[PDB]
Amino acid sequence: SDPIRPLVEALNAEAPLKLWSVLVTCLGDVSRDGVIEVSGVALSSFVERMGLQPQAMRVALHRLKRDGWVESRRLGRVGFHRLSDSALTQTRAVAGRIYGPGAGPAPWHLAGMPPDAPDGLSLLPDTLSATPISRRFALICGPLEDVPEDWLLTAPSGRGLPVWVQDVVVEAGCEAEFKALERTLAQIDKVPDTRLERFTLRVLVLHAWRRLILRSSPAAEAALGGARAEISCRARVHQLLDQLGSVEPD
Template sequence: MTKPNPWFDTAVARLADPQAFKVWSVIVSLFGDLAQQPADRVSGAALTAILQPMGLKPEAIRVALHRLRKDGWIDSNRIGRGSVHFLTDYGRAQSAAVTPRIYDEHPTPASDWHVLIAEDGRAADTLNTLLLTEDYIALGRHAALGSGPLPTECEDLIGFTATAPAIPQWLKIRLFPDDLAQASATLRDAARTISADKPHTEALSTVQIATLRTLVIHRWRRVALRHPVLPPVFHPSDWPEPECRRSVFRLLAALPRPSVSAINDSL
């Protein structure tokens, strides 16, 4: 039985999402951090033990697993009286696609940028396809910002190599909206406070470390995947993400990732 740990309880409360948890999304964060390898299997008991301290009830976990199985993210097998859960090939591919963005402690923005502009009709369709399939950032209904050289297969679009000695405030707000800044600032403050309390990880159980890592990654993922990696000239003057990133990785370093087998075996 896990011993009571007031520091753990306080850390969980500080990392609680200001918005309501979507249980299926938390489970995606958990598997992406702890069980992304093909052989990784998380027991039902371990999954419940990790998620329950967040206030997530077994019934909600079962409903979320059903949704993830239906969507092709997760599969499950019965073993004796229990179950094990694991990412499908599709789930692993989706997790792997965003892993570099989530775990890049020192991202380097591209040095070359370009702008594409479209008219209505076929050109707009071409631009919309690029926004869906490539690393482009919408600047409005008919314009997009992309990294690297101008593409050669977009003859129906107007393209310009972009330089940015100054970025207008309206564009900074569009790229880095207030709600994203608030999410980054609140996570920064929570991670700073928890780290300042000098976590003694030796007093945490394997499952408690997994719970805290899942909470940190879930909150951080919702920041890191929403904003583009752009040079500082594009950032609002008070953009909190760089310090949030430093605080998140400092806390994760104090909570070394446990193996799936260690989590399962601890119960």
């Protein structure tokens, strides 16, 4: 009655799973909790458990090696893979977004760029999340101290959002997508016995959520409000990640 095979089919059906990215999630998750590097054979059993070929893992590791995402050691006949220093710092920068408790009822603001600045959104710090609603105006989230003084900063009125705004925020804030992932995730009923099954399921549930949470806009999320699909979806993922727990591969 295997929980892995149907979950894989389901995730692939919404958006095909790119092995290199699944590997980045896997390596990222283990390094966050102490396992700085995973053996090639241990990694290979995870890739096989998923329904994939060890050949596919080699082509994924070659892609990631050349692109500076992964680093490799050879101690005798065993290969050891880990995220690169570049990849780890980038991974750590999104830890709170992925593993954290979430923004909850986060407030939003509207920011208007000066006339001289066409690509004004690039001038906005990494700490700020911005969803354009017009050529010069965007819905913003984050530290308002990071909003430059030459931008027009304006706050929400008691009024709701006009339909044209709600249409933008529903799309950028992945309301349909978080609902769809939660509905797919609802299928998982029991925790598997095997340490490998528990590990493969955790990486799959984590990858599905990682790929979405990092695609969605926190600004657009804050604009959707407390009833947003991201709340209930995060609620299930972090419950699932707790009931599956953390597995050191063997």
